Design an enzyme around this catalytic site. Structure first.
Site, PDB file in Angstrom:
ATOM      1  CG  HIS A   1      -3.671  -0.321  14.876  1.00 43.47           C
ATOM      2  ND1 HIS A   1      -3.721   1.011  14.542  1.00 43.47           N
ATOM      3  CD2 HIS A   1      -4.888  -0.833  14.591  1.00 43.47           C
ATOM      4  CE1 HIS A   1      -4.921   1.298  14.079  1.00 43.47           C
ATOM      5  NE2 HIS A   1      -5.647   0.192  14.095  1.00 43.47           N
ATOM      6  CG  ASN A   2      -4.349   0.393  10.737  1.00 42.97           C
ATOM      7  OD1 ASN A   2      -4.947  -0.668  10.677  1.00 42.97           O
ATOM      8  ND2 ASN A   2      -4.977   1.549  10.754  1.00 42.97           N
TER       9      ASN A   2
ATOM     10  CD  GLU B   1      -4.401  -3.775  12.312  1.00 44.06           C
ATOM     11  OE1 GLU B   1      -5.118  -3.193  11.463  1.00 44.06           O
ATOM     12  OE2 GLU B   1      -4.238  -3.341  13.471  1.00 44.06           O
TER      13      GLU B   1
ATOM     14  CG  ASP C   1      -6.393  -2.284   7.155  1.00 45.45           C
ATOM     15  OD1 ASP C   1      -6.336  -3.323   7.854  1.00 45.45           O
ATOM     16  OD2 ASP C   1      -6.546  -1.142   7.649  1.00 45.45           O
TER      17      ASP C   1
ATOM     18  CG  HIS D   1      -6.699   3.864   7.432  1.00 46.74           C
ATOM     19  ND1 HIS D   1      -6.640   4.944   8.293  1.00 46.74           N
ATOM     20  CD2 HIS D   1      -7.646   3.029   7.921  1.00 46.74           C
ATOM     21  CE1 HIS D   1      -7.533   4.776   9.247  1.00 46.74           C
ATOM     22  NE2 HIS D   1      -8.143   3.617   9.056  1.00 46.74           N
TER      23      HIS D   1
ATOM     24  CD  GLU E   1      -9.979  -3.436   8.480  1.00 50.50           C
ATOM     25  OE1 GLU E   1      -9.388  -3.423   9.579  1.00 50.50           O
ATOM     26  OE2 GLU E   1     -10.236  -2.393   7.822  1.00 50.50           O
TER      27      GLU E   1
HETATM   28  O1  LIG Z   1      -7.183   0.522   9.851  1.00 50.35           O
HETATM   29  P1  LIG Z   1      -8.155  -0.238  10.912  1.00 50.35           P
HETATM   30  O2  LIG Z   1      -9.233  -1.084  10.038  1.00 50.35           O
HETATM   31  C1  LIG Z   1      -7.353  -1.202  12.182  1.00 50.35           C
HETATM   32  C2  LIG Z   1      -8.252  -1.067  13.395  1.00 50.35           C
HETATM   33  C3  LIG Z   1      -8.726  -2.391  13.992  1.00 50.35           C
HETATM   34  O3  LIG Z   1      -7.691  -3.340  14.095  1.00 50.35           O
HETATM   35  C4  LIG Z   1      -9.972  -2.972  13.332  1.00 50.35           C
HETATM   36  O4  LIG Z   1     -10.342  -3.989  14.329  1.00 50.35           O
HETATM   37  C5  LIG Z   1     -11.074  -1.905  13.436  1.00 50.35           C
HETATM   38  O5  LIG Z   1     -12.312  -2.421  12.990  1.00 50.35           O
HETATM   39  C6  LIG Z   1     -10.733  -0.683  12.607  1.00 50.35           C
HETATM   40  O6  LIG Z   1     -11.811   0.181  12.876  1.00 50.35           O
HETATM   41  C7  LIG Z   1      -9.389  -0.039  13.068  1.00 50.35           C
HETATM   42  O7  LIG Z   1      -8.832   0.747  12.008  1.00 50.35           O
HETATM   43 CA   LIG Z   2      -6.954  -2.128   9.855  1.00 51.46          CA
END
Ligand SMILES: O=P1(O)C[C@@H]2[C@H](O)[C@@H](O)[C@H](O)[C@@H](O)[C@@H]2O1
Ligand SMILES: [Ca+2]
Ligand SMILES: [Ca+2]
Ligand SMILES: [Ca+2]
Length: 513
Positions: A112-113, A142, A144, A157, A191
């Protein structure tokens, strides 16, 4: 005395005893007296002269005993401290599972992230974070993406003060490490918060940098189901929104289209396409498992579900993955940067199947018509109680957990069962004061495990602190079916997953139905 000492400091009774019983009167173990040990004690299935001989060939230090097909106490210990004596099945440390089913049938190592090295609010991001995860076998990463200066997309983030990095720099790193630890497919969860222009740039970079690794077309055949790890081997697939979103990018999303969770199609025929992936926060997932455990499970048979940490975990803390795996959830994303029991269990699970990052779910979690619900256990193949007896015999060279001074560890061992709620348990030994070199506990615990197929056994060593919280010394998590029986050594890891060269626990494991 110089004899006596190296012969003293280096002297393990429990080992002596074990050799004795095995070898009896003899000063040596004959291939036959080793075979019976292998069968009676170690419960090897492949027990037989062939194994015994390889053990002796592999581990016996005495040329005489070797040549004469016998094992000495020394070779006995060496076997016991080897990969063959490991409580974590050596056989399972290589890909040995069916890698031909659709992705949805495997638990997939997910982060995650991934870009983050620390907290979710102001800590730094780095390509390093990606390299690290990939080096630990992570398959699903992931990214972003946000617009950056000079038409160069950045990663960080959104809406926080976390440091930034370049989308392109990240791609090179992924490119460079994607398969260092496994040959099976890497999934990039995008994302995307980029302007259409910068999105185009992203697509350019993806193609430019990933080139042929990138999967940008469906697989010939692959009609009613997701491809298999084997089919996608050596590839990198994008996961994201598929047609505010340029075609260049949307066109690259093949097998994992981000969709809002619809629901589960039991009262109907179809719900999400196998090529559609829903995401659930830790919280929502729990709820769905709480009320719709079998629905979710059944959903998860043909569909990949991704779970991520609750918003409040700005500290990058992690939830328990087990609870999600019990529902057949496959892309259970954790914060790989954060040490703790959660990542311990995570990496323990994924050390299985040669650490390729894809672990075949149990059959009942691969049956679209299952009636399973780890929450409401009924009779079914999953139900198979076993009695585990673990004797924590002794510890060898437990690492000195800092102390920023010259003190001696006061170790204790905790043994935990992780799996369906019904099976979760923990037990701990007494504390041996001032001894890390060779504490001896000789304590045994017994646990009843009803759904071993979903269980993991974890050994944790703490440094007992009277006044403070006990320091963590080492740990090891072993998936149930990789747990070896008999006399074995548990090779302890540091909180960062690192192997601790000579830190071990010597135990005797027995599993009986
Ligand atoms: O840094 P993020 O975008 C990564 C995490 C999830 O994987 C996304 O599904 C979600 O919508 C975000 O709210 C959360 O924080
Ligand atoms: Ca994310
Ligand atoms: Ca002490
Ligand atoms: Ca202590």
């Amino acid at each position: 005395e110089i004899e006596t000492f190296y012969k003293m400091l280096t002297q393990r009774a429990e080992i002596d005893r074990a050799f004795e019983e095995a070898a009896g009167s003899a000063e040596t173990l004959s291939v036959e007296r080793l075979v019976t040990f292998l069968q009676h004690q170690q419960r090897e299935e492949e027990a037989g002269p062939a194994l015994a001989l390889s053990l002796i060939e592999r581990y016996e230090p005495s040329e005489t005993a070797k040549a004469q097909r016998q094992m000495t106490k020394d070779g006995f210990l060496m076997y016991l401290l080897s990969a063959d004596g490991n409580a974590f099945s050596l056989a399972h440390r290589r890909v040995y599972q069916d890698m031909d089913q659709p992705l949805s049938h495997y638990l997939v190592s997910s982060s995650h992230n991934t870009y983050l090295l620390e907290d979710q609010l102001t800590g730094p991001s780095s390509t390093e974070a990606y390299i690290r995860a990939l080096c630990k076998g992570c398959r699903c990463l992931e990214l972003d993406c946000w617009d950056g200066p000079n038409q160069e997309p950045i990663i960080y983030h959104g809406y926080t003060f976390t440091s930034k990095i370049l989308f392109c720099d990240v791609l090179r790193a992924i490119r460079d490490y994607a398969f260092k630890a496994s040959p099976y497919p890497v999934i990039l969860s995008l994302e995307n918060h980029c302007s259409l222009e910068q999105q185009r740039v992203m697509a350019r970079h993806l193609r430019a940098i990933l080139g042929p690794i990138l999967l940008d077309q469906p697989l010939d055949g692959v009609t009613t189901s997701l491809p298999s790890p084997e089919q996608l081997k050596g590839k990198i697939l994008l996961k994201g929104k598929k047609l505010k979103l340029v075609p260049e990018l949307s066109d690259m999303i093949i097998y994992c289209k981000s969709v809002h969770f619809g629901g589960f199609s039991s009262p109907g025929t179809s719900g999400q396409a196998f090529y559609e992936m829903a995401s659930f926060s830790e919280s929502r997932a729990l709820r769905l498992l709480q009320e719709s455990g079998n629905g979710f499970v059944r959903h998860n048979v043909s569909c990949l579900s991704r779970i991520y940490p609750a918003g409040w975990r700005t500290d990058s803390s992690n939830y328990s993955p087990v609870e999600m795996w019990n529902g057949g959830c496959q892309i259970v994303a954790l914060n790989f940067q954060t040490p703790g029991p959660e990542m311990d269990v995570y990496l323990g699970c994924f050390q299985d199947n040669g650490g390729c990052g894809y672990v075949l779910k149990p059959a009942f979690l691969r049956d679209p018509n299952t009636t399973f619900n780890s929450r409401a256990l009924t009779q079914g193949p999953w139900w198979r109680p076993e009695r585990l007896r673990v004797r924590i015999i002794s510890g060898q060279q437990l690492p000195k957990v800092n102390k920023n001074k010259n003190s001696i560890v006061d170790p204790k061992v905790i043994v935990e069962i992780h799996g369906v709620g019904r099976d979760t348990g923990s037990r701990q030994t007494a504390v041996i004061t001032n001894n890390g070199f060779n504490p001896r506990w000789d304590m045994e615990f017994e646990f009843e495990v009803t759904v071993p197929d979903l269980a993991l056994v974890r050994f944790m060593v703490e440094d007992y602190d009277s006044s403070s919280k006990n320091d963590f010394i080492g740990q090891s998590t072993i998936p149930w079916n990789s747990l070896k029986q008999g006399y074995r050594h548990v090779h302890l890891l540091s909180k960062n997953g690192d192997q601790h060269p000579s830190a071990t626990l010597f135990v005797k494991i027995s599993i009986q139905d």
